[PDB]
Amino acid sequence: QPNLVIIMADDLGYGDLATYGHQIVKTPNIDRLAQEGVKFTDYYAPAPLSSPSRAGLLTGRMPFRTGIRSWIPSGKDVALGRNELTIANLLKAQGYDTAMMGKLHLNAGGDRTDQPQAQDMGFDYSLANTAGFVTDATLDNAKERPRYGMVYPTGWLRNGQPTPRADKMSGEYVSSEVVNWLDNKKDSKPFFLYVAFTEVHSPLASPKKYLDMYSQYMSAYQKQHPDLFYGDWADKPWRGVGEYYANISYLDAQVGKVLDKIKAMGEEDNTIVIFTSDNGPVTREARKVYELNLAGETDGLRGRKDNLWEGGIRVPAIIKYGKHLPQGMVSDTPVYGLDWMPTLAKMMNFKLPTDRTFDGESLVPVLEQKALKREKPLIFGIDMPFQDDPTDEWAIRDGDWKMIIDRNNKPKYLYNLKSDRYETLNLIGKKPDIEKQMYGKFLKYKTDIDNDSLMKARGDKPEAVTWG
Amino acid sequence: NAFSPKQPNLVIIMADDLGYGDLATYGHQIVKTPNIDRLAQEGVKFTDYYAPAPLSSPSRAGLLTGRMPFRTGIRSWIPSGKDVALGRNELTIANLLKAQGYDTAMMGKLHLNAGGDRTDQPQAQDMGFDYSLANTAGFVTDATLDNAKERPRYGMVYPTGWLRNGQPTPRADKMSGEYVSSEVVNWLDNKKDSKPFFLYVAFTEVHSPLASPKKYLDMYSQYMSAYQKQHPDLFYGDWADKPWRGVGEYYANISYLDAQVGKVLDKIKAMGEEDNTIVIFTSDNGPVTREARKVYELNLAGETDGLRGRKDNLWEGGIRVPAIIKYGKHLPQGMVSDTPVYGLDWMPTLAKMMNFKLPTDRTFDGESLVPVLEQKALKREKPLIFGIDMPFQDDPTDEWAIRDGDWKMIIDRNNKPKYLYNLKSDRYETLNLIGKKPDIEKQMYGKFLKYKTDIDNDSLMKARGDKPEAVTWG
Ligand code: NA
Ligand code: NA
Ligand code: NA
């Protein structure tokens, strides 16, 4: 009965790792992970934003089914559906020691008794940030302007209980917790770790070591003001790209610390490791005041975080399982976050519930070097109103064809991705019969999603996002 | 109960799609621009200079006439076979200097008419240039690659279809930057008179298609993808279905431009004209970034120093571009100015610097920058005005922007305010103040509508029998 470790990076772009082609950043640990496992070049997140993507991946269900369509606003009634089951829920029922450390972002806050929390979601141990980003209260509530100091996480909960201000930056705070929990394991029970790193989401916080690696990529202003709090960046000169790269290398190091602990404890050959990201990056294209001075890369792919174009949804993914998988295999088979649930059911020898719809397919055939026969197209969504450039709402991927649907059920884009990698040759009005086939397939999938039985069972309905 | 019953020479060097962040002297952390960095070191560098528009043709029309480009009949792109061109009665800096007795010449990108064959439209000669080697198009074509039968196609781009004094040329034996710089150098050699000169050197770099010699590609080998290294001369017409090339080819093209600017500047100095030549180096609009919107925009890497938007956009990154002026030792050397200035300012600035008078029969939008160069404060009597008429875009573009002090308002294509920013507190345009600043909103929208009416009812436009024509072509 194999252990499972799912390592989730935050806003990590498709081109943000050396093994995915980044020409500057040093990511030795994740690069080695890819060499020892299977790396996917055509893997997608279920959504181009944190909350629906994470909900999708943990449930095996298109996020709209689970009640999460985009951001989760403070004080409102948006959370993961009460009757939803996560990988953790199912593995607990198989007799697993379950734990999560880091970003949760599946409810409106840790103090909400009317909403599922980490334990309800199947994690028997948790060090959790319920929010979408790291806060340091000592920087937020500081009186002077400008504010100087590196960001140290406040407001996290260990097993539902308040914690002191961290004495490590977020990545180390997460990884030390993971290593400690593994150090203090009671028995020989199989474990499931969900290591949800907050890197590379704003606010970036990196130790000097990683910062020094990219001093060429810092602006003169950054060098004069390296500790400048991001809350004070709106009216300041550009910082360059080095702080972003530093943060990537810091993440890499903390991933390495988790992987080194698995190997040291004698569990390499018994542990399934999945490394992925929840959505495409924040690039140089900042849309919000909390998005400044970042430098995510998409390997040329169109769009970024928020967007249903490739660079918003295509993300790194690597799977390793001791010596049981082909080492250093690279797969270009189209796969996505919703596939993990059936994959792990098969790999870990548990049955999926049959009282609910799952959207994904087992990837075991891909790992076994066989064809993947996919019955359904890949389906993506985001419900993000009030954007300066209006977002689209749905995307469907079927073979080489990809259709993007606007916030009014109208096809806005149609691409053949094999002849148009960068989504610059819109085929709407040019391919009438492919248009009708793809639109028909969209309506059938949308209808199935909107009429989801499990969502009906909890007295819920698809609710359009009306909030910001 | 209620119900009871010796005149100075002029060289204007215009780069194409060169971004605000694209030069080392503007903070680029990778690219080597020794010649342009030196120009800034020897001159006045503006950090808050704007092009008149976020697209080639209206920007260039604006700069050359001192008039907001819509007044001149150019609102965005110039398609072939249509009637979009610089208005017939418009005068450029070249027309004015021709009448002062200048030897006037133009080399490189024109992009102010629908083609060199169009006898119904003003050409380079009509615009006041007595000598020209011109590309009338918005981009370089190499017919040999365009017409090649094999797919994919391999070969570096050599300019075809350029006109020397109205006449066809053979395919260039040098890539565009060198084709231009060589023409400039030869013209400066072959001239006989001691008449003052005006050179408009309109480089095609860094516009797609990129074309750079091996020397410059080698400078950036680290920044080339594995695929690029295996397929270095792959033709850009065949990039749509191929792996990313990395960012090295873009940097190479920047350094190539820099060397060609250097060649021209070296010639000015070598012929003994450094002390008596005004040199303006600028760009026509913001860059094409990693944010590709079109099949001809792939594998590019323009930088905006973090500023919002890019080419096409009215946000800072689409209109703020590099600008350097040098005039021998007549100007403060190594000066850096953060006074907001723009392309429409050049006409009255040069009128003062070069001692000619502006025509009194037409509206001009800019103001003389002589006070800035004399290290005094500049007071504007008009807002800075920008526009672009670009329909059918995937993310709809906005149409106007006005700038007054630290305040910037962007107007959508339905004539409605969409954004209001204080650039002093919000460099990155992320804090929209629409519905948060009632007095400022009223002041700025009022200033806009006044400026819009004045532009729409331009007298010179009326004099040639024209009107503002909304862009309905693609
Ligand atoms: Na995220
Ligand atoms: Na955009
Ligand atoms: Na241009």
Side-chain angles (χ1 to χ4, degrees):
Chain A
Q1 220 167 209
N3 314 307
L4 176 58
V5 178
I6 297 174
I7 307 176
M8 180 90 73
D10 198 350
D11 292 357
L12 186 71
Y14 182 74
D16 276 347
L17 305 164
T19 192
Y20 280 77
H22 204 285
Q23 287 132 202
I24 299 165
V25 87
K26 296 312 201 172
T27 55
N29 295 286
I30 297 156
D31 290 2
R32 185 159 53 253
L33 181 69
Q35 291 161 197
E36 286 164 3
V38 176
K39 176 178 78 188
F40 296 96
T41 54
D42 295 70
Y43 171 94
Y44 301 81
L49 258 204
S50 305
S51 302
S53 173
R54 287 151 196 277
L57 180 142
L58 285 162
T59 63
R61 282 160 50 79
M62 195 274 166
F64 292 12
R65 298 185 190 273
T66 77
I68 301 170
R69 305 173 72 89
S70 47
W71 44 52
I72 298 173
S74 290
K76 302 312 287 169
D77 299 310
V78 187
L80 193 71
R82 13 167 249 90
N83 56 356
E84 299 284 343
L85 296 166
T86 79
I87 306 168
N89 290 128
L90 294 184
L91 285 181
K92 210 175 123 59
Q94 296 300 131
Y96 277 62
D97 274 343
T98 61
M100 81 81 64
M101 297 77 180
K103 173 158 172 180
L104 187 60
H105 202 26
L106 296 166
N107 61 35
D111 53 0
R112 296 285 298 266
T113 61
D114 60 329
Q115 284 181 355
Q117 302 291 336
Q119 193 160 47
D120 299 296
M121 291 175 192
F123 296 105
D124 283 333
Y125 187 95
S126 71
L127 173 74
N129 189 16
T130 54
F133 58 99
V134 162
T135 280
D136 187 338
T138 77
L139 285 158
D140 291 12
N141 305 119
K143 295 191 280 283
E144 74 276 21
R145 290 299 181 275
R147 295 160 279 189
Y148 292 94
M150 295 317 198
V151 169
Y152 289 83
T154 63
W156 291 31
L157 299 171
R158 185 177 290 102
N159 298 315
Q161 311 311 314
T163 60
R165 178 170 182 269
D167 66 321
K168 281 158 280 195
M169 283 170 261
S170 188
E172 274 171 289
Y173 189 44
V174 172
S175 71
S176 285
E177 192 85 4
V178 169
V179 170
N180 283 340
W181 184 90
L182 289 169
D183 276 342
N184 308 138
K185 98 281 194 288
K186 196 95 266 177
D187 41 29
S188 66
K189 270 172 76 164
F191 61 84
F192 167 45
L193 282 160
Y194 175 55
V195 190
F197 287 112
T198 61
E199 287 81 15
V200 286
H201 202 293
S202 68
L204 312 174
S206 302
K208 203 179 179 293
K209 177 184 176 169
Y210 309 101
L211 291 169
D212 288 348
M213 284 184 171
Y214 309 105
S215 49
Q216 176 187 343
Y217 302 102
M218 304 294 194
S219 71
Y221 187 83
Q222 194 277 345
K223 293 178 199 189
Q224 277 295 321
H225 309 262
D227 272 26
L228 180 62
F229 183 56
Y230 91 127
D232 302 321
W233 284 4
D235 68 326
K236 298 309 191 303
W238 189 54
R239 293 182 75 74
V241 301
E243 287 185 352
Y244 195 82
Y245 302 161
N247 208 240
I248 296 170
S249 292
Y250 181 50
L251 171 69
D252 179 82
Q254 304 322 121
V255 166
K257 197 165 144 202
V258 168
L259 299 176
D260 291 358
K261 181 59 210 173
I262 301 290
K263 193 182 183 178
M265 69 189 284
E267 297 284 346
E268 201 187 348
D269 287 306
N270 321 315
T271 302
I272 300 159
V273 174
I274 295 172
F275 175 87
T276 195
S277 167
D278 63 347
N279 50 257
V282 183
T283 64
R284 290 153 162 86
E285 192 186 345
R287 286 169 187 161
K288 311 285 156 64
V289 76
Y290 48 80
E291 286 181 357
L292 310 180
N293 301 294
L294 309 174
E297 293 279 2
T298 65
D299 195 48
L301 297 166
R302 192 168 188 186
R304 44 141 283 185
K305 181 173 189 191
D306 309 342
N307 296 129
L308 295 163
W309 286 307
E310 293 292 282
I313 53 169
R314 194 183 311 184
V315 292
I318 303 165
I319 186 165
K320 182 193 174 186
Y321 180 30
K323 269 95 199 297
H324 310 300
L325 306 177
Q327 273 74 36
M329 178 184 151
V330 183
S331 183
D332 67 351
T333 302
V335 296
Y336 72 150
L338 304 188
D339 296 334
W340 294 126
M341 182 66 100
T343 301
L344 299 169
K346 193 78 181 69
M347 290 184 74
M348 296 180 78
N349 225 300
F350 62 90
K351 59 184 89 168
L352 287 189
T354 39
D355 68 325
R356 62 199 73 196
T357 307
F358 294 90
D359 290 292
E361 289 278 340
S362 172
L363 303 187
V364 182
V366 177
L367 309 175
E368 287 176 351
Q369 299 167 53
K370 307 182 172 185
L372 183 67
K373 284 142 45 225
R374 202 182 278 279
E375 300 284 300
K376 286 177 269 201
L378 314 188
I379 183 110
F380 307 97
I382 197 70
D383 193 355
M384 189 183 315
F386 323 121
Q387 298 312 285
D388 291 338
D389 293 310
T391 58
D392 297 295
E393 190 169 7
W394 300 86
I396 70 154
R397 168 72 175 282
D398 181 46
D400 305 320
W401 298 102
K402 180 187 183 184
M403 176 178 275
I404 304 174
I405 311 295
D406 70 10
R407 297 180 49 78
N408 259 225
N409 284 12
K410 194 170 170 64
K412 196 178 176 183
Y413 312 101
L414 173 69
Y415 306 113
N416 187 302
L417 296 180
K418 200 168 164 55
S419 57
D420 180 21
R421 194 180 181 254
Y422 304 100
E423 290 172 294
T424 62
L425 299 165
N426 191 3
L427 299 174
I428 294 293
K430 298 189 179 167
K431 265 272 185 269
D433 288 330
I434 299 294
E435 285 175 79
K436 283 168 167 164
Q437 285 173 51
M438 290 291 284
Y439 187 59
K441 288 186 191 210
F442 159 67
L443 289 185
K444 194 181 80 182
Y445 219 144
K446 181 196 197 302
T447 296
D448 195 75
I449 291 164
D450 292 346
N451 292 134
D452 182 79
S453 51
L454 189 73
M455 165 184 264
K456 261 171 182 161
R458 61 169 183 266
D460 271 317
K461 66 167 186 68
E463 292 181 11
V465 175
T466 50
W467 52 88
Chain B
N1 155 65
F3 296 87
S4 58
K6 44 270 286 284
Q7 26 192 210
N9 310 303
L10 180 64
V11 183
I12 301 174
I13 300 176
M14 178 90 68
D16 195 355
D17 292 1
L18 183 72
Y20 183 73
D22 275 349
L23 305 165
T25 195
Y26 281 81
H28 203 283
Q29 285 135 195
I30 300 163
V31 81
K32 296 309 207 166
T33 51
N35 297 290
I36 298 155
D37 288 1
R38 180 75 78 188
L39 188 60
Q41 192 195 329
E42 292 174 349
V44 183
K45 175 171 63 178
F46 300 97
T47 52
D48 294 67
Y49 172 95
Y50 300 89
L55 216 61
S56 299
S57 303
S59 179
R60 285 154 193 269
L63 182 137
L64 282 167
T65 63
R67 289 159 45 79
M68 191 278 163
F70 292 7
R71 301 182 187 270
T72 77
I74 303 173
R75 307 178 70 86
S76 48
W77 45 59
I78 301 177
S80 285
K82 228 255 107 197
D83 299 338
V84 185
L86 197 73
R88 262 279 193 199
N89 60 354
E90 296 283 340
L91 295 163
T92 71
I93 304 165
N95 291 118
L96 298 186
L97 295 181
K98 203 210 181 318
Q100 299 297 132
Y102 276 62
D103 276 357
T104 59
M106 169 274 171
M107 297 80 174
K109 174 176 176 162
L110 182 66
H111 205 25
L112 294 172
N113 66 31
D117 55 283
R118 298 288 292 275
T119 52
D120 53 316
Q121 294 180 348
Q123 298 299 327
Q125 188 181 59
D126 305 313
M127 294 174 203
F129 295 110
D130 289 331
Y131 186 93
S132 60
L133 172 72
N135 187 11
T136 58
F139 60 93
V140 172
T141 285
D142 182 339
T144 70
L145 284 157
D146 284 9
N147 294 136
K149 264 163 267 294
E150 73 275 10
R151 293 296 188 274
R153 289 162 288 181
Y154 293 85
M156 297 312 282
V157 174
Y158 293 86
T160 60
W162 292 32
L163 298 176
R164 190 179 286 104
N165 297 311
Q167 304 307 309
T169 57
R171 178 164 184 255
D173 69 322
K174 279 166 279 200
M175 292 174 219
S176 186
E178 274 169 293
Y179 190 36
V180 175
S181 62
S182 291
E183 196 80 359
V184 171
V185 156
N186 292 353
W187 186 86
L188 287 168
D189 277 332
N190 296 157
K191 72 177 183 74
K192 39 205 77 182
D193 290 49
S194 62
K195 290 166 85 167
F197 62 86
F198 170 42
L199 284 157
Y200 178 54
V201 187
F203 286 116
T204 66
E205 291 81 16
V206 289
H207 201 292
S208 67
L210 306 185
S212 299
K214 191 159 210 298
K215 182 196 189 290
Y216 305 96
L217 299 170
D218 291 338
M219 281 181 205
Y220 306 107
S221 54
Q222 184 199 336
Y223 301 97
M224 303 298 196
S225 73
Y227 188 85
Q228 192 280 340
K229 283 167 173 168
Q230 186 42 54
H231 306 261
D233 56 334
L234 174 70
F235 179 59
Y236 90 129
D238 303 320
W239 288 2
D241 70 330
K242 312 293 193 305
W244 191 52
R245 295 181 77 75
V247 302
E249 295 185 339
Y250 195 79
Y251 302 164
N253 205 236
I254 295 171
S255 296
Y256 185 47
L257 168 64
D258 182 86
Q260 305 321 299
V261 167
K263 180 157 147 204
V264 173
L265 293 180
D266 287 353
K267 186 68 196 182
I268 309 298
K269 190 196 164 113
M271 73 194 184
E273 288 302 319
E274 184 182 5
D275 269 307
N276 211 36
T277 305
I278 306 161
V279 174
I280 299 156
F281 174 80
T282 191
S283 176
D284 60 351
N285 49 256
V288 178
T289 60
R290 291 154 165 81
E291 193 182 350
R293 289 169 186 161
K294 309 288 162 56
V295 71
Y296 45 82
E297 287 183 354
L298 307 183
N299 297 298
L300 304 176
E303 295 280 355
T304 61
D305 194 43
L307 298 169
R308 193 169 185 180
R310 47 142 279 184
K311 194 182 177 180
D312 312 340
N313 297 129
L314 285 161
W315 290 301
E316 290 295 281
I319 53 172
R320 209 192 293 183
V321 298
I324 296 148
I325 189 165
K326 185 203 175 190
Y327 177 26
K329 287 197 199 295
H330 295 241
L331 306 181
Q333 306 84 20
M335 190 184 147
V336 181
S337 175
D338 69 352
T339 302
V341 295
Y342 75 147
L344 304 188
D345 295 332
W346 295 125
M347 188 64 99
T349 296
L350 294 174
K352 189 80 179 74
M353 287 178 72
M354 306 178 68
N355 199 43
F356 62 90
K357 51 182 166 293
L358 298 180
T360 46
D361 59 357
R362 66 199 71 193
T363 316
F364 293 93
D365 291 289
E367 272 166 64
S368 177
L369 302 187
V370 173
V372 176
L373 304 174
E374 286 176 358
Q375 284 211 68
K376 292 178 284 195
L378 193 81
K379 203 257 178 287
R380 296 255 174 205
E381 296 299 335
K382 297 170 184 184
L384 310 186
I385 183 94
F386 313 92
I388 197 69
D389 193 350
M390 194 178 323
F392 320 124
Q393 299 309 295
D394 291 342
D395 296 312
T397 54
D398 299 295
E399 195 163 2
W400 304 86
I402 45 153
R403 171 63 183 285
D404 207 347
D406 307 329
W407 297 99
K408 184 181 189 190
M409 174 174 288
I410 299 180
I411 307 305
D412 71 23
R413 292 178 50 79
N414 300 147
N415 206 44
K416 305 186 179 299
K418 199 190 175 179
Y419 310 112
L420 176 69
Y421 307 113
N422 187 304
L423 296 173
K424 189 190 199 76
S425 53
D426 180 24
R427 193 181 181 254
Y428 305 98
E429 292 173 292
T430 58
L431 302 164
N432 191 0
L433 302 172
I434 290 291
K436 289 179 183 191
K437 287 282 188 290
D439 33 298
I440 293 295
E441 288 167 80
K442 187 169 179 290
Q443 284 165 39
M444 291 286 288
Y445 190 54
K447 278 175 191 159
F448 163 68
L449 290 172
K450 193 180 79 191
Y451 221 144
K452 183 184 192 293
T453 49
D454 190 77
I455 289 159
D456 284 350
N457 306 319
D458 180 78
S459 58
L460 194 75
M461 171 175 260
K462 282 177 172 170
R464 61 174 181 261
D466 282 338
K467 64 213 180 77
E469 316 268 24
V471 174
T472 52
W473 44 93

